[PDB]
């Protein structure tokens, strides 16, 4: 069945070269453990684990967060990360995409964007 990859963390697939993404990704995990939402793997897909980095660069090329909500990009990103592309893969990756990002989307764009003199 679908289920989640045996990989709880994600910073593992990137130890050097991506200090920015490994940090945000490490925080996302520290965020899930913060509310005890799941000390185990949860935002993992069929094959590969989270792939937040590959999903972050893909979502940007996709067009944004709103595009992946009405442009049938759920099956696209699903095919980009190799998960199935059949049917349930899109619906699964859809919930996994929002589970991974969404709250993180605001924790990566809103405020994260170089404080535009934003009250600072």
Measured CA to CA, the distance from residue 113 to residue 107 in angstroms comes to: 9
Measured CA to CA, the distance from residue 102 to residue 111 in angstroms comes to: 14
Nearest CA-CA partner of 3 in 76, 57, 72, 84: 84
Domain of residue 53, CATH code = 1.10.150.60
| Resolved by | NMR
From the number of C-beta atoms within 10 Å of its C-beta (0-12, 13-18, 19+), residue 6 rates as exposed
CA 68 to chain centre: 12
Check: CB of residue 113 under 8 Å from CB of residue 87. no
Measured CA to CA, the distance from residue 57 to residue 18 in angstroms comes to: 13
User: How many domains in the chain?
Assistant: 1
Q: 9 φ, ψ to 5°?
A: -80, -165
Long-range residue pairs from 58-65, CB within 8 A, at least 24 positions apart, any chain: 59/97, 59/101, 65/101, 65/102, 65/105
DSSP class per residue in 44-98: --SSSS--HHHHHHHHHHHT-TTGGGTSSHHHHHHHHTTS--SSHHHHHHHHHHH
CB atoms within 10 A of CB 49: 19
Measured CA to CA, the distance from residue 62 to residue 77 in angstroms comes to: 8
Q: Which range of residues forms the domain containing residue 17?
A: 1-120
């Amino acid at each position: 069945s679908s289920t989640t990859t045996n990989e709880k963390i994600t910073k593992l697939y990137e130890l050097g070269g991506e200090p920015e993404r490994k940090m945000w990704v490490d925080r996302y995990l520290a965020f899930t453990e913060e509310k005890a939402m799941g000390m185990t793997n949860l935002p993992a897909v069929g094959r590969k684990p989270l792939d937040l980095y590959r999903l972050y660069v893909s979502v940007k090329e996709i067009g944004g967060l709103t595009q992946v909500n009405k442009n049938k990009k759920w099956r696209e990103l699903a095919t980009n990360l190799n998960v199935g592309t059949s049917s349930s893969a899109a619906s699964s990756l859809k919930k996994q995409y929002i589970q991974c990002l969404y709250a993180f989307e605001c924790k990566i764009e809103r405020g994260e964007d170089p404080p535009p003199d934003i009250f600072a």
